Amino acid sequence: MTAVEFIEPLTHEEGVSQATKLFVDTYGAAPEGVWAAPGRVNLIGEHTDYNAGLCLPIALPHRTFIALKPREDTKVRVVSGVAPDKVAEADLDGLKARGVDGWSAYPTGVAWALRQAGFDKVKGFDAAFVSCVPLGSGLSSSAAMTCSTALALDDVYGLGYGDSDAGRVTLINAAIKSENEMAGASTGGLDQNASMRCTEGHALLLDCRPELTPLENVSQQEFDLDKYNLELLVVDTQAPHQLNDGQYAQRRATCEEAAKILGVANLRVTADGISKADDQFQALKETLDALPDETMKKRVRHVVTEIERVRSFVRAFAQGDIKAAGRLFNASHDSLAADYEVTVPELDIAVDVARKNGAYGARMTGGGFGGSIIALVDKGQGHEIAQKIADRFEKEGFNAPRALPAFAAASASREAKL
Ligand SMILES: OC[C@H]1O[C@H](O)[C@H](F)[C@@H](O)[C@H]1O
């Protein structure tokens, strides 16, 4: 057997070097520059973004690097280091939703979304992508690709949105629209806000109420694992799963109906009225009594309890109460498994192994149905716990997992410019 693999992040130098070489190898021309956006881990606040809730992501050090050059036509050529001999080619001129074949829908759809928003200066482009955000890990390779492209296009076309947090929300919205409308992949905005608005050493307390302005809807929370002698273990289960299989879309449909039945614009309205009540049990009971469907009650209970767990976590971590922080991780996972029903055995067994082996807490992160777990562990324990999960996976007959180093890293940025 092989020891469990840790997937290291590309350095600035490696990402620039590799994205530039793929660009020159593919297109001959030099790119105008290289941009990059990170993947993410959601610490807590899962399945709350599209309910106008609270989230708490960090940006991983793992980034997607885009070498890009604008074109004076409307042609979009893209290549990825996974498949360097397969250049995808579309044209923005009269391009419609779902008009683009395969992975290239994600970057092409960003240019489309900017044009649809009236950025008429945005024409075609050539790009090359090199990533270390692991595929199928639930760590937002999708956002790393769309957000790196949105930042690169903003820069080369001088749109003026990339150089401010509030400006980056315009580029976030284009990235989200690409994924939802061009690629046909249902997504809230958790991942794209993380990738473009996180900061090094901080978690992004993101308030997803849609009426908030950018300076109202984030709060950088201290997330210095070294201050508490901690390590955030991240394990990609590599469990076989399927994007756009309809499960994630169903959860969203279920929440929207719940909100319709409750007569509220979103479940955050419901959650906040419960949270403010003196008797939160009774406020929840009265809400779930208004939902006749037994699955819908479960989904609403998850959303309401998870939003409050975010607040609880921000307080626990600021207090250095790592046991309390870990219990909140654990209650988030347990809710996602029992009430939201978005876990699978690989996630649940990895989490149990982490819990049994000294984690303060452990949970799936991201959408679920596969992908990754995270665990708050003591510094120096991540490798041991990752290998315990790997040994257990082999006993279970599961695909080997892989792990990634993790800490709160910087958001998207320009990496190089001619
Ligand atoms: O918190 C669950 C997440 O699932 C997926 O990653 C989505 F992309 C995010 O928007 C979010 O809903």
Ligand SMILES: [Cl-]
């Ligand atoms: Cl559902």
